[PDB]
Amino acid sequence: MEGPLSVFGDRSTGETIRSQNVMAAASIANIVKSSLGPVGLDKMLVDDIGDVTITNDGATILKLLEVEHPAAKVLCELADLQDKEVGDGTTSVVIIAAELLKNADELVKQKIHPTSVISGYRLACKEAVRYINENLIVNTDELGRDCLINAAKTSMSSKIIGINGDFFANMVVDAVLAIKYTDIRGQPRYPVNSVNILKAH
Amino acid sequence: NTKRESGRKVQSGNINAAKTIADIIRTCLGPKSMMKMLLDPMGGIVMTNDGNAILREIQVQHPAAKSMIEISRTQDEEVGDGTTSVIILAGEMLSVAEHFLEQQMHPTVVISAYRKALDDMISTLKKIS
Amino acid sequence: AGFDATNILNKLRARHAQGGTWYGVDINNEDIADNFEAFVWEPAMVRINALTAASEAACLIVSVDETIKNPR
Amino acid sequence: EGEETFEAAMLGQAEEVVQERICDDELILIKNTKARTSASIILRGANDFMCDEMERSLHDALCVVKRVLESKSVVPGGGAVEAALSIYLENYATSMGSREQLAIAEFARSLLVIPNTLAVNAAQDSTDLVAKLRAFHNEAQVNPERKNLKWIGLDLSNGKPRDNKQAGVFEPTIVKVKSLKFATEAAITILRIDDLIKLH
Amino acid sequence: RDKPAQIRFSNISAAKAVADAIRTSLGPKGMDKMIQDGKGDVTITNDGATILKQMQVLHPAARMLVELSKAQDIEAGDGTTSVVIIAGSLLDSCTKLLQKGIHPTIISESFQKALEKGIEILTDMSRPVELSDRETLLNSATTSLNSKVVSQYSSLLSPMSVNAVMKVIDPATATSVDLRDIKIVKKLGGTIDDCELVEGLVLTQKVSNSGITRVEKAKIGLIQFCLSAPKTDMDNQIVVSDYAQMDRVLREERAYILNLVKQIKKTGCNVLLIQKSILRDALSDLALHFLNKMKIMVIKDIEREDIEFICKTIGTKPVAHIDQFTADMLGSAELAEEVNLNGSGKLLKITGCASPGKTVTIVVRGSNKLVIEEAERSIHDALCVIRCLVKKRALIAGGGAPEIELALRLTEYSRTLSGMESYCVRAFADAMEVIPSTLAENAGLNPISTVTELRNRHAQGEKTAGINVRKGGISNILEELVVQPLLVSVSALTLATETVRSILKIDDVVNTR
Q: What pairs make up the disulfide bonds (chain A)?
């Protein structure tokens, strides 16, 4: 809806609404870019009128965020998909698409045929997945040199509680192995909340 | 719906409320004590050394003014007093650094400073306590 | 030459990537190809000249948002 | 009822059942539970504050450890995974040719934005980060490997790439491969119209 | 008056105008359309076929196209966007030649000889396949089950799309295979792999509960009568001022009917389809309790579909009140079968019934109408595709790609017509090749490279070849797995032909008041 409007229902009729949608969608996608990560600045976001939510989690916000656009629908949708999917990438999935929805459709009409355009993302969305799954190069709790202790330490070392990675490096090693709950379908994984974790000031 | 906001515009409105919150009570606070008057829409005077009164009684400025009466009641519960202190201290601490540091532009190195002064508080307090 | 430069440029990019001799558009033919081989032929120095001319023309001005103008 | 029948089938089996009070906290300790191996770690803080720190810092490894139990392939947290992918696929654009040449770069060149924003959020910003990330990756270093003369990792909380190769602050390949598929779908999803119209 | 001038444009305009923004079609083009009406009501729209049927248009020649949209559906089921998109193409030729001052009747004359020339060259480029040959029935339906809803399910539906026909198809080449022929009935529950070809006349209906007949040898009922009972069709001797009198009238009701429901069964009835209307309430529901207890299927206020098919395929007539018994005009039934798959849905399966040599039934099943319609919409065109092959054989490419072959070939005959219409016949012979380009339409920037490339390369496909608009790239479009029956587009021509021609016939001033 831009320019003199003879039509309703998000008709800027084409590239206008396309742009207006990439205006729409990205205008949602920006909350995350700053909210990305915990160091990502939280946003105090009114839920109704006096009900404020403070969230740097995007798809959590995108559930607060309400859908006034087809752009607004799907990003809330797809991020809330990724949200209920995991919770890791709720923020993340929101950022790049605003550019990715700023890009391919421009080629999609530059189609010899419209299909080959997004596949430039797709086999690349593969080519990365290949390269991604190829990565053990960082993020290893699969093995450390002392195995999980150092990895749990490197975890605790990447954090600060204060002095850490010492009994806590060890403590992570316990927690999973402390859990004999065998996750279904032969999963060698132990729910970390199934641990009895007790606390002393 | 679909919405986004920016930075100092949202940051200054904090001070804009936070300052005014911090203002008259610092003349009211301490042995020097003043009346913070409210003109009711009804036309009546409400004269306080307490900010929360005039705050609660009137239009709520959303970002800062909604925040402090809470931390006031947070503080009002803690030792029983010092709502006036918290609301003036924060807006005070929120003012000169921010734009200065936000023209230097950074949230975080400001954040660590809140603790160190709060820590430089603790020790010399309990030293000179 | 009445072409789409992009996919012209695209492949010739790849065809300077997977290629890399002269592959490039030829308006004379109205095609693309190795252009030196297409005999698209100009000395090098005129390149360097335009290069030096172009790269220098900008850099000065980008260093200027500050321009004084006086009738006096 | 109090007269309800009772049997020995309700007896729990431990080596000993002891109750130890410490820190001014006491529990009923079931020592060496004989039905299943059982363990409980008791945190020690300086205050109740310290424990929420250790507990969740643990929880960083913990869930990841389990998530690494969920995925052997475990990929660097932070956009340093993308800063590689934002180039290798940007390269994987050109030689592809034509429109996906156009497109695969659009893919990769846009992979750059996560690290910029994130470190901007951590005030580690862009050029430095994106330099450091892709200073690691080379032509000499094209390979995920496991080894770092290309450090493909990025600490999220730091916003600057660091030495943590083992940490539970990084995400496995589980949470990663998806949002690629997700985000591009959004570029796909909006497209889908045939015959733009209006109803009245 | 200048009104016939101004309005004939306004006719062409708002006709073409709406129709022009209507081309996003054929592939993930543009960006999704969320419609919020002039009354401000949110709709989310896409995939213009529905949109063509969704289409809500002010102005009449715009309303002409919603018709024209639906016109292609039953004629083909394929290329409904086609007849809608090309509608502007005739509307194009109008003004330009109306500008030219060509008398619009000449332009109106220009449509038929063209429509005479045009559909022929499509038949001239048409690709022959059969109406009864399960493979030719498969492939056309296959490509029409490839991009349609279900494919994995179509692997079941494609043969049923075919298998339904060999029943329906009358021997060899025959005018055959209507929508009345394959009986398409949704069934609640199951899935699409539960969707199955259920032969003959199978009446989907709501039968009260169970304890019903699943048992063989129905007398399938059509009943216009009430069981004549206290509080049903027969006088109540008991007036109610009292709770002893009010409890009395239902007892005499329910105690009476129990005889007729068995007598209803005594005809051999495992079905009586109630009159769709009410004689008072018509048949009391207290009656319908015991009708089904004797295993007689009852749908009270029966849906329209069963009444006809049972009077049509089965050929059932109403029967006398079972106090009079019946005329044995209950149609042929060897079964009343009410199946719950997923545990869902109530049904009447009639096999051992009169059938024309047509009326195969497909019972479309799914956990919801989604899964149901998933199969349904796909199999239906796959039928309608095969239906087109039946109604008109051979083939053409999908998505107006063959129209460009026509445009080249036709324009010559347009040219060599050298008549007053030939100009118009040339002008509109050139209004075809736009259609693949114009479907590309809405998506993007740095834009325009492929438009005439969506054209030229076909024109440089000789007259035999061009880009595949479905699959991509140049081939011989007519069979690429870019295909629709020859019948499909030759109608789109005819359909859009007189519609636009009617616009040329708009003169003076008309609003009926």
A: none
Q: Does B129 touch chain D (CB under 8 A)?
A: no
Angle (CA) E310-E312-E313 rounded to 5° is: 75
B82 is in an annotated binding site: yes
Question: In sequence order, what are the beta bridge partners of C31?
Answer: C26
Q: Which residue in this structure is represented by tokens 């001038």? A: E5
CB-based contact E32 D198, cutoff 8 Å: no
**Interface contact flag, B63 A44, Cβ < 8 Å:** yes
- Verify whether residue E497 is a known catalytic residue: no
3-state class of D30 per DSSP? strand
Tell me whether residue E213 is one of the annotated catalytic residues.
no
Of B2, B62, B66, the CB nearest to A65: B2
Tell me the backbone φ, ψ of residue E151, rounded to 5 degrees: -125, -60
Residues 6+ apart with CB under 8 A from E156: E192, E193, E195, E196, E375
CA dihedral C3, C9, C10, C14 (to 10 degrees): 130
Amino acid at position A108, single letter: V
C-alpha angle E122/E128/E132, rounded to 5°? 130
Using the structure block, give the residue that is written with the tokens 């990756």: D137
CB E294 within 8 A of CB E263: no
How far is Cα A69 from Cα E310, in angstroms, rounded to an integer? 49
- Residue type for position E482: V
Binding site as annotated, residues of E: 27, 78-82, 146-148, 399, 484
Give me the residues paired with residue A199 across strands: D43
Query: DSSP assignment, residue A42?
Result: P
The minimum CA-CA distance between D103 and chain C, rounded to whole Å, is: 11
Write out the H or E segment, with its range, that includes residue A189.
Answer: none
B62 touches A at CB < 8 Å: yes
A105: nearest CB among E31, E449, E453: E31
Cβ proximity of A53 and A45 under 8 Å: yes
Q: Would residue E381 show up in a list of annotated catalytic residues for this protein? A: yes
Binding residues of A for Mg(2+), by number, are 88
Cα separation values, E367 from A84, A116, E203, E208, E374, Å: 24, 35, 19, 20, 11
Experimental method: cryo-EM
E313 counts as catalytic: no
In angstroms, the CA D176 to CA E137 distance is 45
Alpha-carbon gap, residue D29 to D27, rounded angstroms: 6
C-alpha to C-alpha distance for B68 and B74, rounded to whole angstroms: 9
- Helix, strand or coil, per DSSP, at residue E188: strand
Size of interface A-E (CB pairs under 8 A): 99
Phi-psi region of E359 (alpha: psi -120 to 50; beta: other; left: phi over 0): left
The SS3 of residue E197 is strand
Query: How far is residue E478's CA from residue E489's CA, in Å, rounded to a whole number?
Result: 12
| CA–CA gap between residue E180 and residue E309 (Å, rounded) | 9
Handedness of CA A11, A14, A18, A23 (dihedral sign): negative
Q: Which chains touch E (3 or more CB pairs under 8 A)?
A: A, C, D
Chain E residues with CB under 8 Å of D200 CB are 37-39, 56-58
Among residues E73, E181, E381, E438, the one annotated as catalytic is E381
Q: Which two tokens stand for residue B100?
A: 């200065």
Is residue B106 within 8 angstroms of chain D, CB to CB? yes
* CB within 8 Å of A35: residues ≥ 6 apart: A41, A42, A43, A55, A56, A57, A58, A61, A91, D121
Which residue numbers of E belong to the known binding site for ATP?
27, 79-80, 148
Chains A and E touch (3+ CB pairs under 8 A): yes
Residues E249, E240 contacting (CB under 8 angstroms): yes
Q: What is the C-alpha to C-alpha distance for residues A50 and A46, in angstroms, rounded to an integer?
A: 6
Alpha carbon separation from C63 to C56, C57, C60, C67, E305 (Å, rounded): 11, 11, 5, 10, 81
Chains D and B make contact, 3+ CB pairs within 8 Å: yes
> Which residue spans within E257-402 are E strands per DSSP?
273-274, 347-350, 361-366
